[PDB]
Design a protein around this ligand. Structure first.
Ligand code: VZO
Ligand code: VZO
Lengths: 267, 263
Protein backbone atom coordinates (compact mmCIF):
# COMPACT_ATOMS: atom_id res chain seq x y z
CA UNK A 1 0.00 0.00 0.00
CA UNK A 2 2.44 2.60 1.33
CA UNK A 3 6.15 3.31 0.73
CA UNK A 4 8.77 1.70 2.96
CA UNK A 5 10.68 4.30 4.98
CA UNK A 6 13.97 2.78 6.23
CA UNK A 7 14.19 5.51 8.88
CA UNK A 8 10.93 4.50 10.60
CA UNK A 9 9.58 1.10 9.46
CA UNK A 10 9.13 -1.28 12.39
CA UNK A 11 8.57 -5.06 12.26
CA UNK A 12 4.90 -5.96 12.71
CA UNK A 13 5.97 -9.19 14.45
CA UNK A 14 7.63 -7.10 17.19
CA UNK A 15 4.50 -5.08 18.11
CA UNK A 16 1.62 -6.64 20.07
CA UNK A 17 -1.45 -4.46 20.60
CA UNK A 18 -2.95 -4.10 24.07
CA UNK A 19 -6.20 -2.61 25.33
CA UNK A 20 -7.54 0.51 23.58
CA UNK A 21 -7.33 3.83 25.42
CA UNK A 22 -9.73 6.09 23.56
CA UNK A 23 -11.39 6.86 20.25
CA UNK A 24 -10.09 9.88 18.35
CA UNK A 25 -11.68 11.70 15.42
CA UNK A 26 -8.60 11.04 13.27
CA UNK A 27 -8.31 7.37 14.25
CA UNK A 28 -7.96 5.33 17.45
CA UNK A 29 -5.24 4.98 20.10
CA UNK A 30 -4.48 1.65 21.77
CA UNK A 31 -1.99 0.36 24.28
CA UNK A 32 0.73 -1.91 22.91
CA UNK A 33 4.22 -3.13 23.69
CA UNK A 34 7.12 -3.13 21.23
CA UNK A 35 10.04 -5.55 21.05
CA UNK A 36 13.21 -3.82 19.90
CA UNK A 37 12.27 -0.14 20.04
CA UNK A 38 15.79 0.56 21.31
CA UNK A 39 18.02 -1.01 18.62
CA UNK A 40 18.77 -3.84 23.54
CA UNK A 41 16.55 -5.40 20.85
CA UNK A 42 15.23 -7.95 23.36
CA UNK A 43 14.17 -5.30 25.90
CA UNK A 44 10.49 -4.36 25.64
CA UNK A 45 8.90 -0.95 26.15
CA UNK A 46 5.40 0.43 26.69
CA UNK A 47 4.13 2.38 23.66
CA UNK A 48 0.87 3.63 22.17
CA UNK A 49 -0.43 3.00 18.65
CA UNK A 50 -2.60 5.21 16.45
CA UNK A 51 -4.70 3.26 13.94
CA UNK A 52 -8.02 3.32 12.09
CA UNK A 53 -11.33 2.07 13.52
CA UNK A 54 -13.53 0.92 10.59
CA UNK A 55 -11.52 6.23 3.80
CA UNK A 56 -10.02 9.72 3.89
CA UNK A 57 -9.24 8.91 7.53
CA UNK A 58 -6.34 6.87 6.14
CA UNK A 59 -5.08 9.95 4.28
CA UNK A 60 -5.32 11.99 7.49
CA UNK A 61 -3.51 9.37 9.57
CA UNK A 62 -0.78 9.08 6.92
CA UNK A 63 -0.62 12.89 6.82
CA UNK A 64 -0.14 13.05 10.60
CA UNK A 65 2.55 10.35 10.43
CA UNK A 66 4.51 12.32 7.84
CA UNK A 67 4.12 15.58 9.77
CA UNK A 68 5.57 13.87 12.86
CA UNK A 69 8.57 12.67 10.84
CA UNK A 70 9.08 16.21 9.53
CA UNK A 71 8.61 18.02 12.85
CA UNK A 72 11.22 15.91 14.64
CA UNK A 73 11.75 14.81 18.22
CA UNK A 74 11.36 16.84 21.41
CA UNK A 75 11.12 16.03 25.11
CA UNK A 76 7.74 17.74 25.51
CA UNK A 77 5.76 16.35 22.57
CA UNK A 78 4.38 12.90 21.80
CA UNK A 79 7.20 11.59 19.63
CA UNK A 80 6.89 9.14 16.76
CA UNK A 81 8.64 5.83 17.43
CA UNK A 82 7.88 3.56 14.48
CA UNK A 83 5.40 2.68 11.76
CA UNK A 84 3.97 -0.50 10.23
CA UNK A 85 2.84 0.15 6.66
CA UNK A 86 3.43 -2.96 4.52
CA UNK A 87 1.93 -6.18 5.95
CA UNK A 88 -1.65 -4.92 6.14
CA UNK A 89 -3.14 -2.23 8.37
CA UNK A 90 -1.39 1.04 9.13
CA UNK A 91 0.02 1.40 12.64
CA UNK A 92 1.66 4.59 13.92
CA UNK A 93 3.71 3.84 17.05
CA UNK A 94 4.07 6.80 19.41
CA UNK A 95 5.25 7.32 22.97
CA UNK A 96 3.09 6.14 25.86
CA UNK A 97 1.63 8.63 28.33
CA UNK A 98 0.88 6.28 31.23
CA UNK A 99 -0.98 8.90 33.32
CA UNK A 100 -3.38 10.18 30.63
CA UNK A 101 -4.10 13.79 29.78
CA UNK A 102 -3.08 16.66 32.02
CA UNK A 103 -6.66 17.64 32.90
CA UNK A 104 -7.72 14.28 34.33
CA UNK A 105 -4.25 14.03 35.89
CA UNK A 106 -4.91 17.25 37.81
CA UNK A 107 -8.53 16.48 38.73
CA UNK A 108 -7.66 13.01 40.08
CA UNK A 109 -4.96 14.49 42.36
CA UNK A 110 -7.19 17.23 43.78
CA UNK A 111 -7.23 17.13 47.60
CA UNK A 112 -10.65 16.48 49.17
CA UNK A 113 -10.60 20.20 49.85
CA UNK A 114 -10.94 23.01 49.86
CA UNK A 115 1.39 15.59 45.15
CA UNK A 116 0.30 18.78 43.34
CA UNK A 117 2.73 21.14 45.02
CA UNK A 118 3.41 24.55 43.51
CA UNK A 119 6.75 23.52 41.88
CA UNK A 120 5.04 20.55 40.22
CA UNK A 121 2.40 22.87 38.74
CA UNK A 122 4.99 25.40 37.56
CA UNK A 123 6.95 22.49 36.09
CA UNK A 124 3.86 21.40 34.12
CA UNK A 125 3.38 24.90 32.70
CA UNK A 126 7.08 25.32 31.89
CA UNK A 127 7.24 21.97 30.07
CA UNK A 128 4.23 22.74 27.87
CA UNK A 129 5.79 26.13 27.06
CA UNK A 130 9.03 24.41 26.04
CA UNK A 131 7.08 22.01 23.84
CA UNK A 132 5.09 24.81 22.21
CA UNK A 133 8.30 26.78 21.66
CA UNK A 134 9.74 23.76 19.84
CA UNK A 135 6.59 23.23 17.77
CA UNK A 136 6.63 26.91 16.80
CA UNK A 137 10.27 26.68 15.70
CA UNK A 138 9.18 23.78 13.47
CA UNK A 139 6.47 26.00 11.93
CA UNK A 140 3.74 23.99 13.69
CA UNK A 141 0.53 25.68 14.86
CA UNK A 142 -1.47 23.51 17.24
CA UNK A 143 -4.89 25.27 17.07
CA UNK A 144 -6.27 23.14 19.94
CA UNK A 145 -3.94 23.63 22.90
CA UNK A 146 -5.67 22.67 26.15
CA UNK A 147 -5.00 20.55 29.23
CA UNK A 148 -6.99 17.72 27.62
CA UNK A 149 -4.47 17.75 24.75
CA UNK A 150 -1.41 17.60 27.02
CA UNK A 151 -0.44 14.12 28.20
CA UNK A 152 1.54 12.93 31.23
CA UNK A 153 4.09 10.11 31.33
CA UNK A 154 5.10 7.85 34.23
CA UNK A 155 7.73 10.45 35.19
CA UNK A 156 5.48 13.55 35.11
CA UNK A 157 6.86 14.65 31.73
CA UNK A 158 4.37 16.85 29.88
CA UNK A 159 3.88 15.89 26.23
CA UNK A 160 1.80 17.83 23.72
CA UNK A 161 -0.38 15.53 21.62
CA UNK A 162 -2.18 15.89 18.28
CA UNK A 163 0.13 18.57 16.89
CA UNK A 164 0.35 17.11 13.37
CA UNK A 165 -3.26 17.46 12.26
CA UNK A 166 -16.03 24.52 18.68
CA UNK A 167 -13.82 24.53 21.81
CA UNK A 168 -14.43 28.26 21.96
CA UNK A 169 -13.36 28.71 25.59
CA UNK A 170 -9.72 28.16 24.52
CA UNK A 171 -9.74 30.09 21.24
CA UNK A 172 -8.22 33.51 20.65
CA UNK A 173 -10.60 36.21 19.34
CA UNK A 174 -9.03 36.22 15.87
CA UNK A 175 -9.80 32.49 15.78
CA UNK A 176 -13.29 32.97 17.23
CA UNK A 177 -14.34 35.65 14.74
CA UNK A 178 -11.92 35.70 11.79
CA UNK A 179 -11.13 31.93 11.77
CA UNK A 180 -7.40 32.74 11.63
CA UNK A 181 -4.84 30.78 13.65
CA UNK A 182 -1.34 32.06 14.41
CA UNK A 183 1.33 31.15 16.96
CA UNK A 184 -0.01 34.06 19.03
CA UNK A 185 -3.43 32.41 18.89
CA UNK A 186 -1.80 29.36 20.51
CA UNK A 187 -0.34 31.74 23.10
CA UNK A 188 -3.87 32.83 24.06
CA UNK A 189 -4.75 29.14 24.43
CA UNK A 190 -1.64 28.68 26.58
CA UNK A 191 -3.00 31.33 28.93
CA UNK A 192 -6.22 29.36 29.26
CA UNK A 193 -4.17 26.21 29.85
CA UNK A 194 -2.19 28.06 32.52
CA UNK A 195 -5.47 28.86 34.27
CA UNK A 196 -6.46 25.20 33.94
CA UNK A 197 -3.26 24.14 35.71
CA UNK A 198 -3.51 26.50 38.67
CA UNK A 199 -7.15 25.52 39.17
CA UNK A 200 -6.10 21.84 39.26
CA UNK A 201 -8.20 21.13 36.19
CA UNK A 202 -11.05 23.63 36.34
CA UNK A 203 -13.48 24.47 33.58
CA UNK A 204 -12.75 27.86 31.97
CA UNK A 205 -15.14 30.79 32.42
CA UNK A 206 -17.06 29.13 35.27
CA UNK A 207 -20.74 29.92 35.55
CA UNK A 208 -20.80 32.20 32.51
CA UNK A 209 -22.86 30.76 29.62
CA UNK A 210 -21.11 30.15 26.32
CA UNK A 211 -23.16 32.82 24.55
CA UNK A 212 -21.96 35.69 26.77
CA UNK A 213 -18.29 34.73 26.35
CA UNK A 214 -17.79 36.61 23.08
CA UNK A 215 -19.24 39.93 24.23
CA UNK A 216 -17.43 39.79 27.57
CA UNK A 217 -14.13 39.17 25.77
CA UNK A 218 -14.94 42.09 23.44
CA UNK A 219 -15.62 44.30 26.47
CA UNK A 220 -12.14 43.68 27.92
CA UNK A 221 -13.21 41.18 30.59
CA UNK A 222 -11.11 38.10 31.35
CA UNK A 223 -11.13 35.31 33.90
CA UNK A 224 -10.34 36.19 37.50
CA UNK A 225 -7.21 35.10 39.34
CA UNK A 226 -7.70 31.52 40.56
CA UNK A 227 -7.43 31.05 44.33
CA UNK A 228 -3.93 30.59 45.76
CA UNK A 229 -2.46 31.64 42.39
CA UNK A 230 0.46 34.07 42.67
CA UNK A 231 -0.05 37.42 40.91
CA UNK A 232 3.02 36.82 38.74
CA UNK A 233 1.48 33.76 37.09
CA UNK A 234 -1.87 35.54 36.74
CA UNK A 235 0.00 38.45 35.18
CA UNK A 236 1.31 35.90 32.67
CA UNK A 237 -2.21 34.66 31.91
CA UNK A 238 -3.45 38.22 31.43
CA UNK A 239 -0.60 38.99 29.05
CA UNK A 240 -1.58 35.92 27.01
CA UNK A 241 -5.15 37.26 26.89
CA UNK A 242 -4.34 40.64 25.34
CA UNK A 243 -6.66 41.44 22.45
CA UNK A 244 -3.84 42.30 20.04
CA UNK A 245 -1.71 39.25 19.13
CA UNK A 246 1.46 41.37 18.95
CA UNK A 247 0.91 42.41 22.58
CA UNK A 248 0.74 38.81 23.77
CA UNK A 249 4.09 37.32 24.81
CA UNK A 250 5.90 34.86 22.59
CA UNK A 251 6.39 31.27 23.68
CA UNK A 252 10.09 32.14 24.04
CA UNK A 253 9.24 34.89 26.56
CA UNK A 254 6.86 32.46 28.26
CA UNK A 255 9.65 29.88 28.58
CA UNK A 256 11.93 32.49 30.16
CA UNK A 257 9.24 33.85 32.49
CA UNK A 258 8.17 30.40 33.68
CA UNK A 259 11.83 29.42 34.12
CA UNK A 260 12.40 32.36 36.47
CA UNK A 261 9.40 31.14 38.48
CA UNK A 262 10.68 27.55 38.59
CA UNK A 263 14.07 28.87 39.70
CA UNK A 264 12.45 31.16 42.29
CA UNK A 265 10.74 28.23 44.01
CA UNK A 266 13.74 25.88 43.70
CA UNK A 267 16.04 28.44 45.39
CA UNK B 1 38.02 65.76 40.18
CA UNK B 2 36.09 62.73 38.91
CA UNK B 3 33.61 63.25 36.04
CA UNK B 4 29.96 63.68 37.02
CA UNK B 5 27.75 60.95 35.55
CA UNK B 6 24.03 61.82 35.75
CA UNK B 7 23.14 58.17 35.11
CA UNK B 8 24.78 56.98 38.34
CA UNK B 9 25.76 59.79 40.77
CA UNK B 10 24.30 59.35 44.26
CA UNK B 11 24.27 61.95 47.07
CA UNK B 12 26.57 61.29 50.03
CA UNK B 13 23.96 62.66 52.46
CA UNK B 14 21.89 59.58 51.54
CA UNK B 15 24.68 57.01 52.12
CA UNK B 16 25.77 56.10 55.66
CA UNK B 17 28.70 53.70 55.92
CA UNK B 18 28.33 50.70 58.23
CA UNK B 19 30.72 48.03 59.47
CA UNK B 20 33.38 46.74 57.04
CA UNK B 21 33.21 43.21 55.66
CA UNK B 22 36.69 42.57 54.21
CA UNK B 23 39.84 44.33 53.03
CA UNK B 24 40.44 48.22 48.01
CA UNK B 25 38.01 47.47 50.84
CA UNK B 26 34.29 46.65 50.97
CA UNK B 27 32.02 47.89 53.76
CA UNK B 28 28.37 47.46 54.64
CA UNK B 29 26.25 50.57 54.21
CA UNK B 30 22.71 51.91 54.18
CA UNK B 31 21.33 53.94 51.27
CA UNK B 32 18.31 56.25 51.47
CA UNK B 33 16.36 56.50 48.24
CA UNK B 34 18.36 54.00 46.20
CA UNK B 35 14.99 53.31 44.55
CA UNK B 36 13.66 56.59 43.08
CA UNK B 37 10.26 55.78 47.47
CA UNK B 38 13.08 58.30 48.02
CA UNK B 39 12.60 57.96 51.79
CA UNK B 40 12.95 54.16 51.86
CA UNK B 41 16.34 52.84 52.97
CA UNK B 42 18.10 49.78 51.56
CA UNK B 43 21.02 47.61 52.64
CA UNK B 44 23.90 48.00 50.19
CA UNK B 45 27.65 47.42 50.02
CA UNK B 46 30.29 50.02 49.20
CA UNK B 47 33.68 49.53 47.58
CA UNK B 48 36.25 52.16 48.52
CA UNK B 49 39.98 52.66 48.95
CA UNK B 50 42.07 51.95 52.06
CA UNK B 51 44.45 54.27 53.98
CA UNK B 52 47.59 55.54 44.35
CA UNK B 53 47.13 53.46 41.21
CA UNK B 54 44.45 51.71 43.30
CA UNK B 55 42.26 54.74 42.58
CA UNK B 56 42.70 54.10 38.85
CA UNK B 57 41.82 50.43 39.34
CA UNK B 58 38.70 51.20 41.38
CA UNK B 59 37.59 53.81 38.82
CA UNK B 60 38.27 51.31 36.04
CA UNK B 61 36.10 48.70 37.77
CA UNK B 62 33.32 51.26 38.28
CA UNK B 63 33.28 52.11 34.57
CA UNK B 64 33.42 48.45 33.52
CA UNK B 65 30.37 47.74 35.70
CA UNK B 66 28.58 50.60 33.91
CA UNK B 67 29.43 49.10 30.51
CA UNK B 68 28.55 45.50 31.36
CA UNK B 69 25.08 46.42 32.62
CA UNK B 70 22.68 44.78 35.04
CA UNK B 71 21.95 41.09 35.55
CA UNK B 72 20.20 39.07 38.25
CA UNK B 73 23.24 36.85 38.92
CA UNK B 74 26.06 39.41 39.18
CA UNK B 75 26.89 42.04 41.78
CA UNK B 76 25.17 45.03 40.19
CA UNK B 77 26.28 48.64 40.44
CA UNK B 78 23.78 50.83 42.30
CA UNK B 79 25.39 54.27 42.54
CA UNK B 80 28.61 56.21 42.88
CA UNK B 81 29.89 59.16 44.91
CA UNK B 82 32.69 61.00 43.14
CA UNK B 83 32.57 64.73 43.87
CA UNK B 84 32.89 66.01 47.45
CA UNK B 85 35.64 63.61 48.52
CA UNK B 86 36.66 59.95 48.63
CA UNK B 87 35.36 57.74 45.85
CA UNK B 88 32.53 55.40 46.84
CA UNK B 89 31.20 52.65 44.56
CA UNK B 90 27.79 51.43 45.76
CA UNK B 91 26.94 47.84 44.83
CA UNK B 92 24.35 45.29 45.88
CA UNK B 93 24.48 43.67 49.31
CA UNK B 94 25.12 39.93 49.59
CA UNK B 95 23.91 39.36 53.14
CA UNK B 96 25.04 35.71 53.37
CA UNK B 97 28.66 36.14 52.25
CA UNK B 98 30.42 34.10 49.60
CA UNK B 99 29.12 30.78 48.31
CA UNK B 100 31.94 28.71 49.83
CA UNK B 101 31.43 29.80 53.44
CA UNK B 102 27.68 29.66 52.82
CA UNK B 103 27.99 25.98 51.91
CA UNK B 104 30.44 25.10 54.69
CA UNK B 105 28.34 26.74 57.42
CA UNK B 106 25.24 24.74 56.37
CA UNK B 107 27.02 21.38 56.31
CA UNK B 108 25.27 18.68 58.35
CA UNK B 109 27.35 17.51 61.34
CA UNK B 110 27.79 14.06 59.77
CA UNK B 111 18.73 23.33 54.10
CA UNK B 112 21.29 22.21 51.50
CA UNK B 113 18.89 20.02 49.54
CA UNK B 114 19.77 18.87 46.03
CA UNK B 115 17.40 21.44 44.40
CA UNK B 116 19.17 24.26 46.25
CA UNK B 117 22.59 23.04 45.08
CA UNK B 118 21.49 22.66 41.46
CA UNK B 119 19.87 26.10 41.75
CA UNK B 120 23.21 27.57 42.87
CA UNK B 121 25.02 25.98 39.92
CA UNK B 122 22.35 27.06 37.44
CA UNK B 123 22.39 30.67 38.67
CA UNK B 124 26.17 31.02 38.37
CA UNK B 125 25.93 29.53 34.88
CA UNK B 126 23.31 32.11 33.88
CA UNK B 127 25.48 34.87 35.32
CA UNK B 128 28.56 33.62 33.46
CA UNK B 129 26.50 33.35 30.27
CA UNK B 130 25.52 37.00 30.65
CA UNK B 131 29.06 38.15 31.45
CA UNK B 132 30.30 36.30 28.37
CA UNK B 133 27.70 38.02 26.16
CA UNK B 134 29.09 41.33 27.48
CA UNK B 135 32.65 40.41 26.42
CA UNK B 136 33.64 39.81 30.06
CA UNK B 137 36.16 37.14 31.06
CA UNK B 138 36.27 36.58 34.81
CA UNK B 139 39.61 34.68 35.06
CA UNK B 140 39.03 33.88 38.77
CA UNK B 141 35.71 32.04 38.95
CA UNK B 142 35.41 30.09 42.21
CA UNK B 143 32.93 29.61 45.04
CA UNK B 144 34.74 32.29 47.08
CA UNK B 145 33.92 34.78 44.30
CA UNK B 146 30.20 33.91 44.15
CA UNK B 147 28.10 35.78 46.71
CA UNK B 148 24.71 34.95 48.25
CA UNK B 149 21.87 37.36 49.09
CA UNK B 150 19.10 37.15 51.68
CA UNK B 151 16.98 35.28 49.12
CA UNK B 152 19.70 32.78 48.10
CA UNK B 153 20.35 34.55 44.79
CA UNK B 154 23.83 33.75 43.49
CA UNK B 155 25.77 36.83 42.38
CA UNK B 156 29.15 36.73 40.67
CA UNK B 157 31.55 39.26 42.19
CA UNK B 158 34.77 40.89 40.95
CA UNK B 159 34.04 40.52 37.23
CA UNK B 160 35.13 44.04 36.27
CA UNK B 161 38.76 43.80 37.35
CA UNK B 162 48.21 31.95 41.81
CA UNK B 163 44.90 30.12 42.54
CA UNK B 164 46.08 27.31 40.30
CA UNK B 165 43.53 24.72 41.44
CA UNK B 166 40.81 26.60 39.50
CA UNK B 167 42.81 27.52 36.39
CA UNK B 168 42.58 25.84 33.00
CA UNK B 169 45.81 24.39 31.54
CA UNK B 170 46.09 27.15 28.92
CA UNK B 171 45.97 29.60 31.84
CA UNK B 172 48.44 27.54 33.89
CA UNK B 173 51.07 27.04 31.19
CA UNK B 174 50.42 29.77 28.60
CA UNK B 175 48.92 32.60 30.72
CA UNK B 176 45.97 32.58 28.29
CA UNK B 177 42.43 33.30 29.54
CA UNK B 178 39.34 32.79 27.39
CA UNK B 179 35.68 32.11 28.09
CA UNK B 180 36.49 28.40 27.84
CA UNK B 181 39.07 28.93 30.59
CA UNK B 182 36.22 30.20 32.78
CA UNK B 183 34.28 27.09 31.77
CA UNK B 184 37.06 24.94 33.25
CA UNK B 185 36.82 27.04 36.42
CA UNK B 186 33.05 26.53 36.43
CA UNK B 187 33.67 22.78 36.48
CA UNK B 188 35.82 23.23 39.58
CA UNK B 189 33.10 25.44 41.07
CA UNK B 190 30.53 22.72 40.34
CA UNK B 191 32.73 20.30 42.29
CA UNK B 192 32.88 22.81 45.14
CA UNK B 193 29.08 23.03 45.26
CA UNK B 194 28.40 19.29 45.35
CA UNK B 195 31.10 18.88 48.01
CA UNK B 196 29.37 21.60 50.07
CA UNK B 197 32.49 23.76 49.83
CA UNK B 198 35.31 21.25 49.66
CA UNK B 199 38.90 22.05 48.76
CA UNK B 200 39.70 20.96 45.18
CA UNK B 201 42.11 18.09 44.49
CA UNK B 202 42.06 16.83 48.09
CA UNK B 203 45.13 15.08 49.45
CA UNK B 204 47.29 16.01 46.44
CA UNK B 205 50.22 18.47 46.62
CA UNK B 206 50.10 21.55 44.41
CA UNK B 207 53.31 20.39 42.71
CA UNK B 208 51.73 17.15 41.45
CA UNK B 209 48.63 18.91 40.07
CA UNK B 210 50.17 20.00 36.77
CA UNK B 211 51.50 16.57 35.83
CA UNK B 212 48.26 14.98 37.05
CA UNK B 213 46.26 17.17 34.66
CA UNK B 214 48.74 16.53 31.84
CA UNK B 215 48.29 12.77 32.32
CA UNK B 216 44.52 13.01 31.78
CA UNK B 217 43.63 12.67 35.46
CA UNK B 218 40.86 14.72 37.06
CA UNK B 219 39.04 14.88 40.38
CA UNK B 220 36.79 11.95 41.20
CA UNK B 221 33.02 12.05 41.55
CA UNK B 222 32.14 13.58 44.95
CA UNK B 223 29.96 11.45 47.24
CA UNK B 224 26.20 11.38 46.49
CA UNK B 225 26.82 13.49 43.36
CA UNK B 226 24.71 12.21 40.43
CA UNK B 227 26.59 10.95 37.36
CA UNK B 228 24.87 13.56 35.18
CA UNK B 229 26.45 16.45 37.09
CA UNK B 230 29.83 14.71 37.29
CA UNK B 231 29.57 14.20 33.53
CA UNK B 232 29.17 17.98 33.29
CA UNK B 233 32.26 18.60 35.44
CA UNK B 234 34.34 16.22 33.33
CA UNK B 235 33.20 17.92 30.13
CA UNK B 236 34.35 21.25 31.62
CA UNK B 237 37.74 19.63 32.31
CA UNK B 238 38.47 18.54 28.73
CA UNK B 239 42.02 19.47 27.75
CA UNK B 240 40.94 21.10 24.48
CA UNK B 241 38.91 24.30 25.10
CA UNK B 242 36.73 23.70 22.03
CA UNK B 243 35.71 20.34 23.52
CA UNK B 244 34.52 21.98 26.72
CA UNK B 245 30.85 23.02 26.69
CA UNK B 246 29.90 26.65 26.30
CA UNK B 247 28.21 28.49 29.14
CA UNK B 248 25.03 28.38 27.05
CA UNK B 249 25.13 24.57 26.89
CA UNK B 250 25.82 24.59 30.63
CA UNK B 251 22.69 26.69 31.20
CA UNK B 252 20.59 24.24 29.17
CA UNK B 253 22.04 21.17 30.91
CA UNK B 254 21.63 22.56 34.42
CA UNK B 255 18.10 23.74 33.57
CA UNK B 256 17.16 20.19 32.57
CA UNK B 257 18.52 18.96 35.90
CA UNK B 258 16.60 21.65 37.79
CA UNK B 259 13.46 20.67 35.87
CA UNK B 260 13.96 16.92 36.33
CA UNK B 261 14.08 17.55 40.08
CA UNK B 262 11.11 19.94 40.26
CA UNK B 263 8.78 17.55 38.40
C1 VZO C 1 -7.26 8.57 22.58
O1 VZO C 1 -5.96 8.98 23.04
C2 VZO C 1 -5.88 10.39 23.33
C3 VZO C 1 -4.41 10.73 23.75
N1 VZO C 1 -3.50 9.91 22.98
C4 VZO C 1 -2.46 9.17 23.66
C5 VZO C 1 -2.72 8.47 24.86
C6 VZO C 1 -1.65 7.79 25.47
N2 VZO C 1 -1.88 7.02 26.68
C7 VZO C 1 -2.79 7.30 27.72
O2 VZO C 1 -3.53 8.29 27.74
C8 VZO C 1 -2.81 6.23 28.85
C9 VZO C 1 -3.62 6.14 30.00
N3 VZO C 1 -3.28 5.04 30.64
C10 VZO C 1 -3.91 4.60 31.91
C11 VZO C 1 -4.20 5.82 32.82
C12 VZO C 1 -5.23 3.85 31.54
C13 VZO C 1 -2.29 4.38 30.00
C14 VZO C 1 -1.57 3.16 30.26
C15 VZO C 1 -0.58 2.78 29.34
C16 VZO C 1 0.25 1.50 29.50
N4 VZO C 1 0.58 1.15 30.87
C17 VZO C 1 1.17 2.06 31.72
C18 VZO C 1 1.48 1.69 33.02
N5 VZO C 1 1.22 0.45 33.47
C19 VZO C 1 1.55 0.08 34.79
C20 VZO C 1 0.65 -0.44 32.63
C21 VZO C 1 0.32 -0.08 31.30
C22 VZO C 1 -0.34 3.60 28.20
C23 VZO C 1 0.70 3.22 27.19
O3 VZO C 1 1.87 3.46 27.40
N6 VZO C 1 -1.02 4.70 28.00
C24 VZO C 1 -1.96 5.08 28.87
N7 VZO C 1 -0.43 7.76 24.93
C25 VZO C 1 -0.14 8.40 23.81
C26 VZO C 1 -1.15 9.12 23.13
C27 VZO C 1 -0.82 9.88 21.81
N8 VZO C 1 -0.59 10.43 20.85
C1 VZO D 1 34.65 42.31 46.44
O1 VZO D 1 33.78 41.20 46.75
C2 VZO D 1 34.17 40.41 47.89
C3 VZO D 1 33.12 40.69 49.01
N1 VZO D 1 32.39 41.86 48.60
C4 VZO D 1 30.97 41.99 48.85
C5 VZO D 1 30.45 41.61 50.09
C6 VZO D 1 29.06 41.74 50.28
N2 VZO D 1 28.50 41.38 51.57
C7 VZO D 1 28.85 40.29 52.39
O2 VZO D 1 29.69 39.45 52.08
C8 VZO D 1 28.07 40.27 53.73
C9 VZO D 1 28.19 39.39 54.83
N3 VZO D 1 27.32 39.79 55.75
C10 VZO D 1 27.14 39.12 57.06
C11 VZO D 1 27.22 37.58 56.88
C12 VZO D 1 28.26 39.62 58.03
C13 VZO D 1 26.64 40.89 55.34
C14 VZO D 1 25.61 41.71 55.94
C15 VZO D 1 25.13 42.79 55.18
C16 VZO D 1 24.05 43.74 55.70
N4 VZO D 1 23.09 43.09 56.57
C17 VZO D 1 22.28 42.09 56.10
C18 VZO D 1 21.35 41.50 56.94
N5 VZO D 1 21.23 41.91 58.22
C19 VZO D 1 20.29 41.31 59.08
C20 VZO D 1 22.02 42.90 58.67
C21 VZO D 1 22.97 43.51 57.82
C22 VZO D 1 25.67 43.04 53.89
C23 VZO D 1 25.18 44.19 53.08
O3 VZO D 1 24.67 44.00 51.99
N6 VZO D 1 26.61 42.27 53.39
C24 VZO D 1 27.08 41.23 54.09
N7 VZO D 1 28.25 42.25 49.35
C25 VZO D 1 28.72 42.62 48.17
C26 VZO D 1 30.09 42.52 47.87
C27 VZO D 1 30.63 42.96 46.48
N8 VZO D 1 31.03 43.28 45.46
Amino acid sequence: DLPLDPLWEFPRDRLVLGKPLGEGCFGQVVRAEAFGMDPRPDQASTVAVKMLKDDKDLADLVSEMEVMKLIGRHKNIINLLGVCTQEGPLYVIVECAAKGNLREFLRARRPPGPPLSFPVLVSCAYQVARGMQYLESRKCIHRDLAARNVLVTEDNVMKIADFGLLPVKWMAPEALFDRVYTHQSDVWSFGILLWEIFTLGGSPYPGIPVEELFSLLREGHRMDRPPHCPPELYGLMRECWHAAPSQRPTFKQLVEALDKVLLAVSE
